[PDB]
Amino acid sequence: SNNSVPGAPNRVSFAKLREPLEV
Amino acid sequence: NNPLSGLTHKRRLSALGPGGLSRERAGLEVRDVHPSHYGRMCPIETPEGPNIGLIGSLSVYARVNPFGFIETPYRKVVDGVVSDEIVYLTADEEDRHVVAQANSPIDADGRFVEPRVLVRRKAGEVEYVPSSEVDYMDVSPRQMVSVATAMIPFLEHDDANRALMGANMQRQAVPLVRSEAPLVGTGMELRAAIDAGDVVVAEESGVIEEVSADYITVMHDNGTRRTYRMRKFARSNHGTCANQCPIVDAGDRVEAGQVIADGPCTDDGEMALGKNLLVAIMPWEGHNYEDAIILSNRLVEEDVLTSIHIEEHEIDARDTKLGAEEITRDIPNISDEVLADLDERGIVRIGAEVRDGDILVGKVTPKGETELTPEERLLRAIFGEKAREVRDTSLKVPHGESGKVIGIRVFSREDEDELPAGVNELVRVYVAQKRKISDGDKLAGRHGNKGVIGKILPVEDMPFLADGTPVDIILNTHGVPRRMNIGQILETHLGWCAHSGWKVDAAKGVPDWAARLPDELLEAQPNAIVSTPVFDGAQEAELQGLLSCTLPNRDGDVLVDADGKAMLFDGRSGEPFPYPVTVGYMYIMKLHHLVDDKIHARSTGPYSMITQQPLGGKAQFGGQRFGEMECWAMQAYGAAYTLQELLTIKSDDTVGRVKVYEAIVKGENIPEPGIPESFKVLLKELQSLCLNVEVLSSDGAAI
Amino acid sequence: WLSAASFQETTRVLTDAAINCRSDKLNGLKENVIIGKLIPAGTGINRYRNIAVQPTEEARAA
Amino acid sequence: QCGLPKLMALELFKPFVMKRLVDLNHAQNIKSAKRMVERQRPQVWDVLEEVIAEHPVLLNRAPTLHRLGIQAFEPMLVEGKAIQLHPLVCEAFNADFDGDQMAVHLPLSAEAQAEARILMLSSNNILSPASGRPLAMPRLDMVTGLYYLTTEVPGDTGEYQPASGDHPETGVYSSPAEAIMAADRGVLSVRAKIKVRLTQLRPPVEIEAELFGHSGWQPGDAWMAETTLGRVMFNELLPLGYPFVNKQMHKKVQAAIINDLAERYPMIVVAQTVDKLKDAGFYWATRSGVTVSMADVLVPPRKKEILDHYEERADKVEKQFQRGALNHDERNEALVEIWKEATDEVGQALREHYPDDNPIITIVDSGATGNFTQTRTLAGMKGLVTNPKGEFIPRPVKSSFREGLTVLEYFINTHGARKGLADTALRTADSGYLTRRLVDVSQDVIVREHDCQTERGIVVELAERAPDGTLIRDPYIETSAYARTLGTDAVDEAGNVIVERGQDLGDPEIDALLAAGITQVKVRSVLTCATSTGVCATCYGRSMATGKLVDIGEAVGIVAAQSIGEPGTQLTMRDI
Amino acid sequence: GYDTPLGITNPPIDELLDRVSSKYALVIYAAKRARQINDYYNQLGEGILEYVGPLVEPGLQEKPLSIALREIHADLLEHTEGE
Amino acid sequence: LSQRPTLSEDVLTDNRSQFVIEPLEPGFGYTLGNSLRRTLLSSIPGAAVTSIRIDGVLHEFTTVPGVKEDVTEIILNLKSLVVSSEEDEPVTMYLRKQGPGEVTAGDIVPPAGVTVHNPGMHIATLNDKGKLEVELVVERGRGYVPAVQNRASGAEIGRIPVDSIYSPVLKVTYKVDATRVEQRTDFDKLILDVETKNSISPRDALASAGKTLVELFGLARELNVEAEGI
Amino acid sequence: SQRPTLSEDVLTDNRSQFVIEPLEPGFGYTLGNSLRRTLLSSIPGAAVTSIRIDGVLHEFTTVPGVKEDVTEIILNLKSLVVSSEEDEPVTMYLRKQGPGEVTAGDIVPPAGVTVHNPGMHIATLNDKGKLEVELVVERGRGYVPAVQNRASGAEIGRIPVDSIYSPVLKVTYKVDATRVEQRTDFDKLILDVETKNSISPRDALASAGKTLVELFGLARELN
Ligand SMILES: [Mg+2]
Ligand SMILES: [Zn+2]
């Protein structure tokens, strides 16, 4: 799971770039 | 107003206040965008009124160092290779290097793919650069926006005006009674929701002991138990409702730092400011003409846009020298039926629906001791009812409110409650109604496309789809190409694709238009929630290709074509429309401009002793003001009698208003407007300054 | 003088007025509003405000 | 009419409801009756209908820039909590429908009521005071409707065909009812070239002269029109006996028709035909098929080809900056010329590529709304965007808003939009100040007498004769010498008079005066009156709202101040 | 030739303006007569009856002003312009 | 569940009449409206001219020698000839005239079963010294049937196809207003408008279309027994 | 050629298609639009008008030992499907104590009141809480605001509810035409009805047919 949050419902993403640092 | 509004309120950069430049003193250059805000203060988000540019909002990644400057993180490219270590730079340190943007093509090593990179140099300068002169690079292509801006799908497709109204408007959405997250959204909403603090998170890891509506009890692996309350129907500051709902099922394993309850506006731990609605873009017999909106009755019957609004009113028992007031059940000259709702205490019992004018708290002041009037001695003598030492000042329901009495609260001197100096008991009362949407409430999408609902059709009149689903909202065409923001059309297309699910042609191979499409996206199940970040979402070719692979309907057929247009049937006529209309889904929110708040009328009322004009206010049904350009309008008409009527008997002259009211109730002609009582006062004041003013008649003699 | 006294320098204007013992007529909308008397334009001028209406003699009741 | 929330029209008329409510005897005493209206008892609504049956009310929306900003409507009752405006008064009230709010005022006296019902009912102020043009005319969607209902599509369905040889000729219809039946079975498109024979619509002025011999034309006679069924459908609406229009219903043309109606007919006729136009327009705007989808916006086919040539040109200017032959500022100048020219090119290309049937072309092209530049930025490049100073940035945004802008283009672009917002928010108040000064200066100017009888007039130049031949009508006569009443008698080069002294001017007489061959006339204006107070009517000219002589007692001064000071929020700049 | 007028728009304002001298005059003209017709209903029970009742036939629950304009259209009244 | 009945008024002119139907259950305005219009225009039987046959016409574009009108004008005038017939077979009637002057509609001598309802209609204006002979074929039908949908069945040298108005009714329009029945004020008032040919009356055609529609909705009513009370 | 027109039936358990033919040309869309418009608004049904939770005074509160609050329970009850035969308000009961989900098929109806989806989810019960409700079922048509309980003036314990007594769900149609040049020109309407399992499709179509024969019975009359 790419998302940091434990049990977050997942959204497929139209992300072309990987994010280096989390918000 | 909701989670997003609070989180935005706390991240605010205000320019005004004690110890700063004035609002009138700040030149027009202080208020506009500066090339050094990039990545610290959002250029898009700002208030729209007269404080434009004077209140910004802290950017997403920006953070403040000790001294008091705002820093933004970069990553550093030593020699054309991008590092994983990140440095926070201030605005003056950043001016000394060369910063390349997050869209630069990168290898897997971090090697720069092209010879020349686009970069920002010094202040307000953009230029290509050979790959060696590149020192830093941006964290994320959405580094330059705020938190509210970050939740606008297809934000690089709108203009700055409509983007501004979109960001601005999201923080005035009313939380509904149910929430669903948007079918198309930014990666921003899970993060924003968890941070803004209105979801309950789980502190440790453990197993759910027991779930209530009131509390969750967690069992740690350590052995000790943590119980979380959920405040139920709290009156938040802005009259909307706050509600927390345990989201997890009983006997489950919860990770540390996981969502456990769903605050107002949050679904599943997600910033949900509206609902998903089936929209079709066309004009429909001038009911949505000029930016109004046509709503389908299904919403009002299903409660899709119902809200809960909780009021409070407060009255108290303060000492006067004539005596100490008191809050008590019996009240002189009020029948028994009217006082049925109050109890023995004087306060209305919890759950009795109150129409306006009703009594909520029954209080009596010890009436100022005058003599008992003789006419009143015979009037009260024939019946034998004494006007006691007390007049009646009971708390009453203002006009235009209704609902139930959910909770009352009282402060006393005996309880040991802290009280204000000179008051013995304070009483508040909460009344909560449940609003369904109707005419004259404001709706808005996310791209600053506001609107009032001008009509609600009955379910069987909405243009309906080839399989008999009627659309829900009919948004006119003429405001899309004029605002110059087409993010809403793309949000609709993508939205329809999220509704039906899709399956690309991957058996023959992957078609070219989906080369860079992620693998999890090749094939979605109906009603799958996608995310498209800001400045990095679905491209055009990818959207258009997604509209050819939409899953066929449960009847077997496919409803929207390669363009996104569908065939609609007219509910009234029953014919098909002569062309395909664009249907699809959209995310609509119910703003906080409701017709029940913003309606006041006033035939007469209570005046103010000194100015002698009708007493203002929305809460005392004050009269509405008649400025000076309305007088110039009057005089350009030649309407002498209307303007002379407004200026005299409708505001100032007491004699006039009494005579007009009386003549109207009596059923005779209203007196023809003469000379204001104000005139004689102007003359008494000019006669005070030893000037001598006389009035001359036609002949030349005084009067 | 009645119109002048409302714009600025009330005391000055009034002083010159009161020495001169000058009388201003009430042509003009500004002055007329200030006193509160019907403004002399449209349905305010005297060749409209003073009308009489009789039922025509030819009209003979039942 | 107008629509009035019944919960608010109960409060507003409260005393009247009380009088009628003790009159009925529902309440024993008036004081008790007032109590009854406070509890909204079910008997009061029946009375509150009677009370507002024939009362007038004043609607108003601030800020009032001009006199038509306050207008009087006869109120009807509605459920709900929103006031209901008629769609044709958003031009004058300046009202969108996205949260605006309106005052309601109730004239109480007999005098008040009368003059609100005669002097400022909406059905009386169809023509704008500032100019003799109609404000309350079909406007935003109705223009799309009546544009789609009058387009003639060549090659459409059931379209007329001339028969050669054995085959019969189709597409000729005996009556309008017959072509409606044909277009309901589906053999006929609402807009194909068909040859009807019409009997209830006066033929055009060129055809009437030869078909009916200039002996007249009367309802009941038949002449063969050669139009599309939509245009016949459109002539159904405008008043009876009006000659038959037969061209595409652009917004200019609807304007021309409404003026032609307003100066040749009573006010009730215009007031009704405008309404039949509004309704038939709303009907057709729906079946018009104007929608915006992502496949509608087209990107121009050779934009890639154009931006390479131009971008390379600017590259040459850049190399000349490195040489040092062009100063920094001169480099700015050259760049701004390059990208201005390139934005022009892409704009034009995009205009050629677009089909005529496209909704993005059509919604703007009929004059319904919008402007071609916005369509350009939507489909081609956004072009040069300006600074926080107002000066152009030598960098040019090169992505369409359909495409998406790069974070950098977007940031660069914020400036112009934000500064536009603040500066419009300044313009409105500043214009308001200009209006206040302009009211104070001419507070005194009123129509005092009917005719001061001078002989001094302005000289107006009616048309500037071409040196090569004949004459050329001046561009702005409709502003210069139209309401003007003729100051002297208009002697021509022959002994005869083409227009006489004291007769108002109008386009029939301006065209007579023009065909005569006299280029200048001396008219009678406010600049040369000779009255003690204000101006006399005969030499102020006709009025603008009415279309007749201005009334003795009107306050033309305040009206002219409104006029000049109101379109000040639409002025802009882009040295002096 | 026109559609039949409805509501407050009847009677047509052109035919009204034909009787009266100028647009402003029709207002005072109407409001005085309507004031009278309002007075007649209170002088009728008791007192001097110097004002003449509503001339053309008044429909039910019609306002005085409407009766007024209705009878200005019938040429039942005459006015003397101001001084 | 009870509903108050509804009554229809009639306002009359020569052949046109307005009907009004009030007061209807909210939202039934269009329900009854569009279908009632389509039945009035589409359903009722009637008889019209279908094909003409003019004597000295080789091909169509010519004009019949010695007439003022055109083949197309002649066809439009015949297309307006109001006819009634009580037989199903395609009857044939001739028309002949001579000398100077006008040839009106009453001038055809119809065989049994055919009545011309406006005999004062104008067909053509003949100059002097010529005789015209035209043959007409009358048929029964419904609604509007184009001639092109008829076209040429088989081959003929001098046949002409003529669009057919099988209709008693000519133009039906309607509008739906909101009427205040009670304090609710959502009830609907339909305003129908019907203008017919000479051969039927509007107050009669409305009854015809109403019976047709009752027999059509009757089927769904035949499916089961579920009450609805007045 | 004149043939009377009759409608065929195509079966599926909850939603059936119908076939009406032949018809006059162009007449198919309007006819089907009528049947549709009647179906969606005017079939008699039944629903729940007012509920009564024991231990609750109004909608804006909770119960001890329930997972959801009162508004949530009401929002589940809006999906109940209840068919009633009597003509006057009838009362149902619902009692469930201890651990476990409580579902729609736990109501104890009177004689003549059925609950057609007895597997619908109402609420979840913790071990601490025991739920007890009484409901009132009246039969109407269309949709009805909840406020209509408040002007009655009943006791404090009673909550009004919204009422949707519509038993149709999804109605559509499609018109298959024949446009040949010969006389064989006719329209073929194909309707489609889908109900809530409270009444069958043929049954709803029957009620709407009845309605329309009534509304045309006064308007076919000779003038
Ligand atoms: Mg607005
Ligand atoms: Zn003059």
Contact C41/B at CB under 8 A: yes
Residue G22 CB burial class (10 angstroms; 0-12, 13-18, ≥19): buried
CA distance D275 to D86: 10
End-to-end C-alpha distance for chain A, whole angstroms: 17
Cβ atoms D204, D246 nearer than 8 A? yes
The neighbour count for residue B74, using CB atoms within 10 Å, is 24
Quickly tell me which residue has 């308007």 as its tokens: G219
Helices (H), chain G: 28-41, 70-77, 201-217
Burial (CB count within 10 angstroms: exposed 0-12, middle 13-18, buried 19+), residue D200: middle
Residues in the 5 Å CB sphere of ion ligand 2? D 452, 529, 536, 539
Other CB atoms within 10 A of residue B320 CB: 11
Question: Could you tell me if B461 lies within 8 Å of chain F, comparing CB atoms?
Answer: yes
Give the closest ligand to the alpha carbon of residue D448.
2
- Written out in words, the top-level CATH class of the domain with range G45-165 is mainly beta
User: What amino acid is encoded at F109 in this protein?
Assistant: V
Q: C-alpha angle D334/D335/D339, rounded to 5°?
A: 120
Query: Cα(E40)–Cα(B594) distance, rounded to whole angstroms?
Result: 47
CA–CA distance, G203 with G197 (Å, rounded to integer):
11
d(CA D309, CA D291): 35
Instruction: Give the residue numbers in C contacting E (CB under 8 Å), as ranges.
Output: 42-43, 45-56, 59, 61
> Which residue is closest to B84 within chain A, CA to CA?
A20
CATH superfamily of G1-44+166-223: RNA polymerase, RBP11-like subunit (3.30.1360.10)
Q: How far is CA G191 from CA B75, B141, B386, F34, G6, in A?
A: 64, 53, 76, 18, 13
What SS3 state is found at B214?
Answer: coil
Residue of B nearest to E41 (CA): B668
Residue in chain G closest to F43 (alpha carbons) equals G24
Amino acid at F50: T
Give the C-alpha separation, D190 to D283, whole Å: 13
Are B3 and B271 in contact by the 8 Å Cβ rule? The answer is yes
- Give yes or no for B647 touching D (CB within 8 A): no
User: Beta strand F144-145 with F164-165: parallel, antiparallel or unpaired?
Assistant: antiparallel
Q: Strand B136-138 vs strand B98-100: parallel, antiparallel, or unpaired?
A: parallel
What amino acid is encoded at D302 in this protein?
A: R
Query: For residues B451 and B294, what is the distance between their CA atoms, to the nearest angstrom?
Result: 10
Q: B376 is written with which tokens?
A: 């009143």
State how far residue F14 is from chain B, nearest Cα, in angstroms.
30
Report the C-alpha gap between F97 and B523 in whole angstroms.
80
Residue extents of the structural domains in chain G: 1-44+166-223, 45-165
Q: Is B285 helix (H, G, I), strand (E, B) or coil?
A: coil
**Nearest by Cα to B59 from B36, B76, B82, B80:** B36
- Give E79 Cα–ligand 2 centroid separation in angstroms: 28
Residue count (chain G)? 223
DSSP code per residue over B443-499: EE-SSS---BEEEEE-GGGS-EETTSPBPSEEE-STTHHHHT--HHHHHHHHHHHHH
Could you give the CA distance from residue D541 to residue D528 in angstroms, rounded to a whole number? 13
Nearest CB among F5, F30, F228 relative to G211 is that of F228
Q: Tell me the chain F residues in contact with residue G181 when contact means C-beta distances shorter than 8 Å.
A: 149-151
The DSSP string of chain F is ------EEEEEE-SSEEEEEEEEEPTTHHHHHHHHHHHHHHHTS-EEEEEEEEETT-SSTTS--TTBSS-HHHHHHHHHT--EE---SS-EEEEEEEESSEEEESTTS---TT-EES-TT-EEEEE-SS-EEEEEEEEEEE-SEE-HHHH--SS--SS-EE--EE--SEEEEEEEEEEE-SSSS--EEEEEEEEEE-TTS-HHHHHHHHHHHHHHHHHHHHHS-------
Q: Beta-carbon neighbour count of residue B592 at 10 Å?
A: 21
Contacts of residue D380, Cβ cutoff 8 Å, sequence gap at least 6: D299, D300, D303, D346, D347, D349, D350, D400
For B548, which DSSP code?
A: T
Distance of alpha carbon D217 from alpha carbon D198, whole angstroms? 12
Ligand nearest to the CA of D533: 2
Q: Peptide bond preceding E11: is omega within 30 degrees of 0, i.e. cis?
A: yes
Residue ranges of the domains in chain E?
1-83
CB G211 within 8 A of CB G36: no
3-state helix, strand, coil in chain G (%, to 5): 20, 40, 40
The closest ligand to the CA of D455 turns out to be: 2
Q: CA nearest D234: which of D175, D190, D268, D287?
A: D190
Give the separation between CA F105 and CA F117, rounded to whole angstroms: 9
- End-to-end Cα separation, chain C, in angstroms: 58
CB B169 within 8 A of CB B450: yes
Per DSSP, the three-state class of D43 is coil
DSSP state of D443: T
Of D400, B269, G179, F65, the C-alpha closest to A9 is B269
CA B635 to chain centre: 40
Strand order in the sheet with B215-220: B225-229, B215-220, B206-211, B253-254
F52 within 8 A of F136, measured Cβ to Cβ: yes
Nearest CA to G219 among F199, F27, F28? F28
Give the Cβ contact number of residue B69 at 10 Å: 13
Nearest-Cα distance to chain A for B463, in Å, is 32
Residues in A closer than 8 angstroms to B185, CB to CB, are 11
Residues of E in contact with C39 (CB under 8 A): none
Contact B185, B498 (CB under 8 A): no
Nearest CA in chain F to B461: F27
Any idea which fold F1-45+167-230 has?
Gyrase A; domain 2 (3.30.1360)
User: Structurally, what CATH architecture does the domain formed by F46-166 represent?
Assistant: Beta Complex (2.170)
Which residue is associated with the tokens 């307003």? D262
Nearest to E26 by CA among G74, B620, D117: D117
CA dist B445 and B447 (Å) reads: 6
- Spatial contact of B141 and B113, defined as CB atoms under 8 Å apart: no
Sort out which chain G residues have CB atoms less than 8 A from D186's CB and list them. Answer: 26
* Alpha-carbon distances, residue D189 vs B380, D141, D186, D229, D248 (angstroms): 84, 22, 7, 8, 16
Q: Which approach determined this entry?
A: cryo-EM
CB B500 within 8 A of CB B546: no
* Residue D156, annotated as binding a ligand: no
For residue B630, give the H/E element and its range. Answer: helix B629-637
User: Closest Cα partner for G68 from B68, B245, B249, D123?
Assistant: B245
Can you tell me the distance from the alpha carbon of D329 to that of D39, in angstroms, rounded to the nearest whole number? 76
Tell me the chain F residues in contact with residue D46 when contact means C-beta distances shorter than 8 Å: 183
Phi, psi (rounded to 5 degrees) for D558: -60, -35
| CA D419 remoteness from chain centre | 29
DSSP summary character for residue D99:
S
What is the rounded distance in angstroms from the CA atom of residue B521 to the CA atom of residue A14?
8
Could you give the count of Cα atoms lying within 13 Å of B283 in the half-sphere of its Cβ?
28
